[PDB]
């Protein structure tokens, strides 16, 4: 078709790792992470295409090439429905909503485009100091339920990077950002700009 679909797995053609946008509306317009609100874009019967890392859930850790991530929903126990289900399906293992699942061959799972937002900075040295940054493709290694801070069950996910483009914080990634002349994209008139 004529439309560039975000519901396609993998990188968006023309959007290299290291691309930066001041606002979420711009990330959405690029197609890299379509949802205006949702932290994950995915379909419960298919898989997850993208996610934004923006802090929240204190138990989550972000080590750049790997990170943990907590589901949504549930006040009550979280279920493997909606985007929780979508993300679980990416994992290279049959779906299990009782104990979760782990992929031995996790690189064979479905790709997730990951954008890091400034708001994840308290618990992440990899969050951009401003706006939003596309950091590449990651894969779901394992997921599992556990008791949350609330006392109710939450779904947790461990993702690992699996991308031919180097991480944008790496010397090699910084070199690409310079070569490609990537800079913070501000909307027309904002600064004004």
From Swiss-Prot:
Name of the coding gene: UHRF1
Function: Multidomain protein that acts as a key epigenetic regulator by bridging DNA methylation and chromatin modification. Specifically recognizes and binds hemimethylated DNA at replication forks via its YDG domain and recruits DNMT1 methyltransferase to ensure faithful propagation of the DNA methylation patterns through DNA replication.
Tissue: Expressed in thymus, bone marrow, testis, lung and heart. Overexpressed in breast cancer.
Consequence recorded when altering residue 60 to G: Abolishes ability to bind hemimethylated DNA
Domain YDG: 10-161
Description of how the protein assembles with itself and partners: Interacts with DNMT3A and DNMT3B. Interacts with DNMT1; the interaction is direct. Interacts with USP7; leading to its deubiquitination. Interacts with histone H3. Interacts with HDAC1, but not with HDAC2. Interacts with BLTP3A. Interacts with PML. Interacts with EHMT2. Binds hemimethylated CpG containing oligonucleotides. Interacts with ZNF263; recruited to the SIX3 promoter along with other proteins involved in chromatin modification and transcriptional corepression where it contributes to transcriptional repression. Interacts with UHRF2. Interacts with FANCD2.
Reported effect, residue 57 to G: Decreased ability to bind DNA
Subcellular location: Nucleus
The protein, known as: E3 ubiquitin-protein ligase UHRF1
Required for formation of a 5-methylcytosine-binding pocket: region residues: 57-60, 69-72
Glycyl lysine isopeptide (Lys-Gly) (interchain with G-Cter in SUMO2) crosslink location in chain: 125
Binding-site residues, DNA: 54-55, 60
Illness association: Defects in UHRF1 may be a cause of cancers. Overexpressed in many different forms of human cancers, including bladder, breast, cervical, colorectal and prostate cancers, as well as pancreatic adenocarcinomas, rhabdomyosarcomas and gliomas. Plays an important role in the correlation of histone modification and gene silencing in cancer progression. Expression is associated with a poor prognosis in patients with various cancers, suggesting that it participates in cancer progression.
Superkingdom of the source species: Eukaryota
Induction details: Up-regulated in proliferating cells, and down-regulated in quiescent cells. Down-regulated upon adriamycin-induced DNA damage, in a p53/TP53 and CDKN1A-dependent way. Induced by E2F1 transcription factor.
Impact after mutating residue 34 to A: Decreased ability to bind DNA
Parent-record interval covered: 414 to 614 of 793
N6-acetyllysine PTM positions: 125
UniProt modification remark: Ubiquitinated; which leads to proteasomal degradation. Autoubiquitinated; interaction with USP7 leads to deubiquitination and prevents degradation. Polyubiquitination may be stimulated by DNA damage.
Domain notes: The tudor-like regions specifically recognize and bind histone H3 unmethylated at 'Arg-2' (H3R2me0), while the PHD-type zinc finger specifically recognizes and binds histone H3 trimethylated at 'Lys-9' (H3K9me3). The tudor-like regions simultaneously recognizes H3K9me3 through a conserved aromatic cage in the first tudor-like subdomain and unmodified H3K4 (H3K4me0) within a groove between the tandem subdomains. The YDG domain (also named SRA domain) specifically recognizes and binds hemimethylated DNA at replication forks (DNA that is only methylated on the mother strand of replicating DNA). It contains a binding pocket that accommodates the 5-methylcytosine that is flipped out of the duplex DNA. 2 specialized loops reach through the resulting gap in the DNA from both the major and the minor grooves to read the other 3 bases of the CpG duplex. The major groove loop confers both specificity for the CpG dinucleotide and discrimination against methylation of deoxycytidine of the complementary strand.
Region entry Required to promote base flipping, spans: 36-37
